[PDB]
Amino acid sequence: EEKEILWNEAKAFIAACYQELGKAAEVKDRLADIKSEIDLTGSYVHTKEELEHGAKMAWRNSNRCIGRLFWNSLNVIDRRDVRTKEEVRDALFHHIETATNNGKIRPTITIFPPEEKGEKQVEIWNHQLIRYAGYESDGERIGDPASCSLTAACEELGWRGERTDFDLLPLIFRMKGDEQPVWYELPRSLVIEVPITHPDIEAFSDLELKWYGVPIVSDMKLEVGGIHYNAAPFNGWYMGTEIGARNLADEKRYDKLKKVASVIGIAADYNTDLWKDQALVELNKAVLHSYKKQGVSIVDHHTAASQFKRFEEQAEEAGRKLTGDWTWLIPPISPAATHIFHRSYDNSIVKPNYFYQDKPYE
Amino acid sequence: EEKEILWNEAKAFIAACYQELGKAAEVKDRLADIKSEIDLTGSYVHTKEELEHGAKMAWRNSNRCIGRLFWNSLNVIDRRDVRTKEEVRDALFHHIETATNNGKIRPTITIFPPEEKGEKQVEIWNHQLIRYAGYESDGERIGDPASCSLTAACEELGWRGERTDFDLLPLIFRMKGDEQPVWYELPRSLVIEVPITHPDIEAFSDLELKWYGVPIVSDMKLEVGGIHYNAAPFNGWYMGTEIGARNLADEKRYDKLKKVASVIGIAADYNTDLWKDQALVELNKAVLHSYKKQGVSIVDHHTAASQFKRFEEQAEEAGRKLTGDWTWLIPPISPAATHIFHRSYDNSIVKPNYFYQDKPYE
Numbered sequence: 036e037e038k039e040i041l042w043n044e045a046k047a048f049i050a051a052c053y054q055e056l057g058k059a060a061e062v063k064d065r066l067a068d069i070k071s072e073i074d075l076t077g078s079y080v081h082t083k084e085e086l087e088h089g090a091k092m093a094w095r096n097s098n099r100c101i102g103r104l105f106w107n108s109l110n111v112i113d114r115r116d117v118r119t120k121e122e123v124r125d126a127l128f129h130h131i132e133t134a135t136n137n138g139k140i141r142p143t144i145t146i147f148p149p150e151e152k153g154e155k156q157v158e159i160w161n162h163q164l165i166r167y168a169g170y171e172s173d174g175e176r177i178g179d180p181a182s183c184s185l186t187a188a189c190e191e192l193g194w195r196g197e198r199t200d201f202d203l204l205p206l207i208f209r210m211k212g213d214e215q216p217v218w219y220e221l222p223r224s225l226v227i228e229v230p231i232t233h234p235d236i237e238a239f240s241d242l243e244l245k246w247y248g249v250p251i252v253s254d255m256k257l258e259v260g261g262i263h264y265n266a267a268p269f270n271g272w273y274m275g276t277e278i279g280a281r282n283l284a285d286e287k288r289y290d291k292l293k294k295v296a297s298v299i300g301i302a303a304d305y306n307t308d309l310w311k312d313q314a315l316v317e318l319n320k321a322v323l324h325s326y327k328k329q330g331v332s333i334v335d336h337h338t339a340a341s342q343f344k345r346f347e348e349q350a351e352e353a354g355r356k357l358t359g360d361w362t363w364l365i366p367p368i369s370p371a372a373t374h375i376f377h378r379s380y381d382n383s384i385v386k387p388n389y390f391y392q393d394k395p396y397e
Numbered sequence: 398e399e400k401e402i403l404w405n406e407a408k409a410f411i412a413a414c415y416q417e418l419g420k421a422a423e424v425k426d427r428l429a430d431i432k433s434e435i436d437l438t439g440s441y442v443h444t445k446e447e448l449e450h451g452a453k454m455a456w457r458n459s460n461r462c463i464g465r466l467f468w469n470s471l472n473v474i475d476r477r478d479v480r481t482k483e484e485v486r487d488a489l490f491h492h493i494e495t496a497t498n499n500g501k502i503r504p505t506i507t508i509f510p511p512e513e514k515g516e517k518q519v520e521i522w523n524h525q526l527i528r529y530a531g532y533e534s535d536g537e538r539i540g541d542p543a544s545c546s547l548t549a550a551c552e553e554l555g556w557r558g559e560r561t562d563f564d565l566l567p568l569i570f571r572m573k574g575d576e577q578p579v580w581y582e583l584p585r586s587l588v589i590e591v592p593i594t595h596p597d598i599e600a601f602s603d604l605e606l607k608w609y610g611v612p613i614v615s616d617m618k619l620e621v622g623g624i625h626y627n628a629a630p631f632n633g634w635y636m637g638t639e640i641g642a643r644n645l646a647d648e649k650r651y652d653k654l655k656k657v658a659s660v661i662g663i664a665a666d667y668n669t670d671l672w673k674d675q676a677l678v679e680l681n682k683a684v685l686h687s688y689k690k691q692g693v694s695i696v697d698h699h700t701a702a703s704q705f706k707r708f709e710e711q712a713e714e715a716g717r718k719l720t721g722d723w724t725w726l727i728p729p730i731s732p733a734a735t736h737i738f739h740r741s742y743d744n745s746i747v748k749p750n751y752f753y754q755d756k757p758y759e
């Protein structure tokens with residue numbers, strides 16, 4: 036039964052992957068040797084080539100991703116050889132370093148041993164390798180409320196935050212066999228942060244806003260040809276709106292719009308003044324300015340949309356069906372100013388792809 | 398066959414309508430007398446009460462409408478008695494007047510004779526009773542490009558525009574029997590227009606922007622209990638983003654953002670400056686300011702969203718399933734700053750409702 040769903044997903048993936056790689060004749064035999072390995076072992080192992088390309092296809096099939104134009108240049112790191120928690124830690128540390136690249140961010144994925152029996156070899160608890168802690172107790176809100184449950188979990192395991200609004204969470208993951216995860220504090224020299232300043236408004240620094248340079252999503256499962264890589268953190272660079280329009284602006288996140296309106300010198304009294312909209316623009320301007328000023332890669336939502344239009348064009352030209360999630364592709368500011376808003380997308384799920392999986396904490 | 402689909406839609410509507418009206422016991426007999434009239438005549442006629450309430454239910458079921466909180470106060474004008482084109486014209490003229498109400502806009506619908514055999518008694522060509530003409534010929538673009546095909550149609554029928562960017566289209570509709578529609582120029586005293594000025598930036602008047610006060614959508618079919626009112630123009634007041642973020646901003650409409658950026662004194666050179674986003678905010682501020690300054694009703698998208706949240710609450714409280722089209726409910730500016738963005742909606746079609754129908758021109 037499980038042996039079957041593995042085989043069908045394998046046939047579909049190998050065919051498409053070898054087609055794209057210009058190795059269509061190699062299919063027949065590779066497909067045969069896989070079928071054998073399935074019968075014998077209950078699973079099969081990807082070559083470096085299959086895995087690298089699979090990860091790339093997976094990004095290409097991510098309906099919600101506006102940044103897909105660069106799918107083919109993803110930097111794939113094959114860490115299926117790790118066996119220990121020191122290795123997992125060091126691989127994660129290394130991911131941060133090479134992906135950050137002094138600010139010239141390389142879109143990178145580190146791939147760990149896949150699920151065996153549906154049994155995890157490694158299980159990463161972090162939502163992102165770099166994120167800020169969050170604390171809610173007795174009317175006191177500190178840091179990122181989205182990180183509240185993970186922070187409280189780390190604090191059960193012996194970690195303690197300094198309770199600034201920007202405490203870096205430790206790396207926390209669990210190895211197969213161990214009932215409890217381990218956690219490792221992050222070396223500050225590895226983590227680039229960007230202070231938020233405004234190009235025109237000097238007072239903007241009084242808000243003492245900052246964000247981390249590299250978003251490294253680490254809780255999603257990569258699925259390639261019937262193989263489940265539940266631990267495979269990947270990154271791109273940020274689109275400014277992620278920081279300025281959501282992380283810093285959402286009421287249930289940092290909720291800074293009222294403070295932003297104050298430093299930019301406008302009233303936050305009437306809906307008709309559109310002070311929130313104005314706050315959002317200046318904050319988003321601020322974010323872009325600050326990242327560029329420091330040498331940390333970032334894209335604005337207009338450029339991002341232009342790139343994604345090219346992705347649409349490149350897709351049709353290659354004879355590939357395009358898939359997308361309109362509700363996630365439009366940017367949270369001025370979406371009607373992008374072509375994305377004015378067309379529709381098929382939201383079908385094609386594999387290889389990245390998927391949600393259940394959290395171990397909570 | 399047609400007699401059947403009419404009966405089932407009638408049973409569903411009368412039941413729900415009499416339930417809401419507190420007349421549940423009157424159903425039995427009203428339903429019986431309808432069934433008779435169906436057998437005898439092939440159709441049935443709504444009472445003033447059924448029709449009024451039906452129009453209200455139809456608005457309430459409009460998935461794409463953010464303004465549904467006020468569904469129950471819709472002002473229904475019953476003009477099923479018109480037989481002539483002078484009557485149709487005068488009813489349309491009257492709609493404009495009472496709905497405008499010196500700027501204190503009354504949400505109004507005028508209801509004309511429904512389709513008989515699926516045969517129209519009246520067929521309105523205007524998309525809205527008040528709209529601006531549009532001209533595209535030889536690299537010259539004038540007025541509203543969305544009105545290009547209707548403008549060219551009116552010009553076939555003997556109308557001629559002055560070719561300003563704001564020529565008011567004539568009312569144009571066709572009566573049953575007549576092979577061709579008629580057109581009637583709009584009396585300027587009936588049409589309120591609002592010049593666009595900015596509260597802070599005096600130079601904004603140099604753009605010589607204006608818009609009409611009352612959007613009166615006139616090409617949709619109202620369906621109430623199996624009866625098709627193909628001619629039933631209705632109106633609300635504008636949400637500012639409709640004018641500032643779409644009509645005036647869309648490249649395929651008035652396309653004013655570059656001009657807006659110039660008068661507000663910012664460069665329109667780099668995506669990272671977010672000059673479009675900034676332009677959009679000031680233009681939208683300008684629109685709201687100008688409507689309020691003149692005494693013409695308008696709502697901003699934040700207030701509109703707050704009202705729609707109340708509509709959600711009022712719906713659940715009344716034990717009614719809520720339906721909505723997320724992609725149309727979010728406003729085209731700062732959607733993530735409204736609760737609408739952060740939840741989902743069922744997009745099922747419930748009748749009574751308003752529907753698209755095929756255009757007679759084109």
Ligand code: HEM
Pocket residue numbers: 090094097099100101102103105109142143144269270271272273274277334339363389
């Ligand atoms: C290179 C720069 C990239 C940019 C600018 C970019 C941009 C985005 C943005 C803005 C989102 C929406 C995030 C949200 O609203 O929560 C997104 C979603 C996503 N991106 Fe990308 N992305 C990039 C690279 C990548 C890479 C390298 C991968 C994986 C190999 C990836 C996979 C995804 C996935 C899976 C989602 C959806 C996650 C979900 O459903 O919650 N992206 N992308």
Ligand code: HEM
Pocket residue numbers: 452456459461462463464465467471504505506631632633634635636639696701725751
């Ligand atoms: C009272 C103030 C009202 C406001 C502020 C309002 C707001 C809106 C807005 C902003 C839209 C989206 C328009 C677009 O993006 O193209 C919309 C759609 C709609 N509204 Fe309303 N509305 C109001 C009253 C009404 C009334 C009185 C009716 C009918 C009785 C109505 C029926 C609809 C329908 C049918 C649509 C969807 C049209 C389509 O699918 O293209 N609304 N409304």
Ligand SMILES: CN(C)Cc1ccc(OCc2ccc3ccc(N)nc3c2)cc1
Pocket residue numbers: 102162250252254255270271272273274277391
């Ligand atoms: C915690 N999850 C259950 C919710 C969740 C998981 C992954 C998510 O990924 C968003 C995402 C993924 C990849 C990205 C790559 C680059 C970029 N700038 N943003 C990116 C943003 C979002 C929400």
Ligand SMILES: CN(C)Cc1ccc(OCc2ccc3ccc(N)nc3c2)cc1
Pocket residue numbers: 376377378379724725
């Ligand atoms: C694939 N296309 C040819 C068909 C198609 C394209 C865009 C579609 O909708 C995009 C869209 C989404 C939201 C909107 C909200 C308001 C508005 N005026 N237009 C809006 C338009 C629908 C169908």
Ligand SMILES: CN(C)Cc1ccc(OCc2ccc3ccc(N)nc3c2)cc1
Pocket residue numbers: 464524612614616617632633634635636639753
């Ligand atoms: C020409 N049609 C095929 C496309 C089309 C038709 C009606 C449409 O109605 C939009 C609409 C409808 C009712 C409204 C009521 C109030 C308001 N402020 N806007 C409103 C906007 C939009 C597009």
Ligand SMILES: CN(C)Cc1ccc(OCc2ccc3ccc(N)nc3c2)cc1
Pocket residue numbers: 362363738739740741
């Ligand atoms: C009905 N809810 C309990 C379930 C539910 C609510 C909102 C949902 O999505 C809203 C939504 C739409 C677009 C988004 C784009 C980006 C982002 N970070 N979140 C976004 C969230 C999905 C499911």
Ligand SMILES: [Cl-]
Pocket residue numbers: 250277282
């Ligand atoms: Cl993030």
Ligand SMILES: [Cl-]
Pocket residue numbers: 612639644
């Ligand atoms: Cl309009």
